Write a protein that holds these residues in place. Sequence first.
Motif, short mmCIF file in Angstrom:
data_model
loop_
_atom_site.label_atom_id
_atom_site.label_comp_id
_atom_site.label_asym_id
_atom_site.label_seq_id
_atom_site.Cartn_x
_atom_site.Cartn_y
_atom_site.Cartn_z
N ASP A 17 -0.51 -1.05 6.88
CA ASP A 17 0.56 -0.65 5.93
C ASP A 17 -0.21 0.21 4.94
O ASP A 17 -1.26 0.75 5.30
N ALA A 18 0.28 0.35 3.72
CA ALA A 18 -0.44 1.13 2.74
C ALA A 18 -1.55 0.25 2.17
O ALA A 18 -1.34 -0.93 1.93
N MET A 19 -2.73 0.81 2.00
CA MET A 19 -3.82 0.04 1.43
C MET A 19 -4.43 0.78 0.26
O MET A 19 -4.71 1.97 0.33
N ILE A 20 -4.72 0.04 -0.80
CA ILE A 20 -5.29 0.64 -1.98
C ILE A 20 -6.39 -0.26 -2.46
O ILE A 20 -6.29 -1.48 -2.32
N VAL A 21 -7.46 0.33 -2.98
CA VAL A 21 -8.57 -0.44 -3.53
C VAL A 21 -8.76 0.01 -4.98
O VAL A 21 -8.77 1.21 -5.23
N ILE A 22 -8.88 -0.93 -5.92
CA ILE A 22 -9.08 -0.59 -7.34
C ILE A 22 -10.30 -1.35 -7.86
O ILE A 22 -10.69 -2.38 -7.27
N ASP A 23 -10.91 -0.84 -8.93
CA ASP A 23 -12.00 -1.58 -9.53
C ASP A 23 -11.36 -2.61 -10.47
O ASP A 23 -10.12 -2.71 -10.55
N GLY A 24 -12.20 -3.30 -11.22
CA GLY A 24 -11.75 -4.30 -12.16
C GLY A 24 -11.04 -3.78 -13.39
O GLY A 24 -10.70 -4.55 -14.26
N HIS A 25 -10.86 -2.46 -13.48
CA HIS A 25 -10.14 -1.86 -14.61
C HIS A 25 -8.84 -1.24 -14.14
O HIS A 25 -8.21 -0.48 -14.89
N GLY A 26 -8.46 -1.52 -12.88
CA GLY A 26 -7.24 -0.98 -12.32
C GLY A 26 -7.30 0.46 -11.86
O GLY A 26 -6.26 1.07 -11.57
N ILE A 27 -8.51 1.01 -11.81
CA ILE A 27 -8.72 2.37 -11.34
C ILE A 27 -8.84 2.43 -9.82
O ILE A 27 -9.69 1.75 -9.23
N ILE A 28 -8.04 3.30 -9.22
CA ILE A 28 -7.97 3.52 -7.78
C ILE A 28 -9.26 4.14 -7.24
O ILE A 28 -9.65 5.23 -7.64
N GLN A 29 -9.92 3.40 -6.34
CA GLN A 29 -11.16 3.86 -5.73
C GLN A 29 -10.88 4.45 -4.36
O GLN A 29 -11.49 5.43 -3.97
N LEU A 30 -9.96 3.82 -3.62
CA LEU A 30 -9.63 4.29 -2.28
C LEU A 30 -8.12 4.24 -2.13
O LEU A 30 -7.47 3.37 -2.69
N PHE A 31 -7.57 5.16 -1.35
CA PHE A 31 -6.13 5.28 -1.18
C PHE A 31 -5.91 5.78 0.24
O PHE A 31 -6.20 6.95 0.51
N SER A 32 -5.39 4.92 1.12
CA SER A 32 -5.20 5.27 2.52
C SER A 32 -4.11 6.31 2.77
O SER A 32 -3.25 6.55 1.92
N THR A 33 -4.15 6.85 3.99
CA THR A 33 -3.20 7.86 4.45
C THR A 33 -1.79 7.32 4.36
O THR A 33 -0.93 7.90 3.72
N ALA A 34 -1.59 6.11 4.87
CA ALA A 34 -0.28 5.49 4.82
C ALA A 34 0.18 5.32 3.37
O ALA A 34 1.37 5.35 3.09
N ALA A 35 -0.75 5.08 2.44
CA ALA A 35 -0.31 4.93 1.06
C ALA A 35 0.16 6.29 0.53
O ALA A 35 1.07 6.36 -0.30
N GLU A 36 -0.47 7.36 0.98
CA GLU A 36 -0.10 8.70 0.54
C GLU A 36 1.34 8.95 0.96
O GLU A 36 2.16 9.37 0.14
N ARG A 37 1.64 8.62 2.22
CA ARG A 37 2.98 8.79 2.78
C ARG A 37 4.01 7.98 2.02
O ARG A 37 5.11 8.45 1.75
N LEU A 38 3.65 6.75 1.67
CA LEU A 38 4.56 5.88 0.95
C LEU A 38 4.80 6.21 -0.54
O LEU A 38 5.94 6.24 -0.99
N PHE A 39 3.73 6.42 -1.30
CA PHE A 39 3.87 6.68 -2.74
C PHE A 39 4.04 8.15 -3.18
O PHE A 39 4.44 8.44 -4.33
N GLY A 40 3.75 9.06 -2.26
CA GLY A 40 3.86 10.48 -2.54
C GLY A 40 2.69 11.12 -3.29
O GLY A 40 2.83 12.21 -3.81
N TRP A 41 1.54 10.45 -3.37
CA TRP A 41 0.37 11.02 -4.04
C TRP A 41 -0.69 11.19 -2.98
O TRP A 41 -0.79 10.34 -2.10
N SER A 42 -1.44 12.29 -3.02
CA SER A 42 -2.52 12.46 -2.06
C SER A 42 -3.68 11.60 -2.57
O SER A 42 -3.76 11.24 -3.74
#
Length: 117
Positions: A1-26
Motif C-alpha cells: 500500500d502506501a508507505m512512509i517513513v518519518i524521523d522522530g520529529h515527523g519529517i518524511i525521510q522516505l515516500f514510496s511510489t504508491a504513496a505518491e499516487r495516493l497523496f499526490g506529492w512526488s
Amino acid sequence: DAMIVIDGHGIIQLFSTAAERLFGWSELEAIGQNVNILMPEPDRSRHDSYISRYRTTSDPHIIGIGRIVTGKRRDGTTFPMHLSIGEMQSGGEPYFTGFVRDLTEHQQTQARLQELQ
Ligand code: HEM
C-alpha cells in the motif's frame, strides 16, 4: 500500500511510489516536509504533540493497534484510510513507518448500499 517513513520529529525521510499516487506529492516534494502535510486540521496542527506525547509516555494510541482516519490529498480532497505504524531505530534515533490503506472504495460502496435502502 502506501508507505512512509518519518524521523522522530515527523519529517518524511522516505515516500514510496504508491504513496505518491495516493497523496499526490512526488517523493522529492514530500521528503523534507512534516508528515502533517498529509492530513487536515485539527490533526495537522496537533500531529507533533501526538508524536511528542508518545515519545514522552511510551503509551501508544495507534502503534500496534491501527486506526481508520482521514488523510488529505495535494488537491485538498480528504479520504478515509487505515493507518498502521511501525517503530524502528537507526543511527541511535527513532524512525516510524506508516502503512496506508485507501478505504475510499469501501466507504463509497457502503454509502451507496445504504442510500438504495
Ligand atoms: C496521513 C494521515 C494521518 C493521520 C490522520 C494521523 C493521525 C494521528 C492520530 C490521531 C494520532 C494519535 C493521537 C491520539 O489518539 O492521541 C497519531 C499518532 C501518531 N502518528 Fe499519525 N497520522 C497520519 C499519518 C501518519 C503517518 C504516515 C505516520 C508515520 C509515517 C504517523 C506517525 C504517527 C506517530 C509516530 C504517532 C504516535 C504513535 C502512537 O501514538 O502510538 N502518522 N496520528
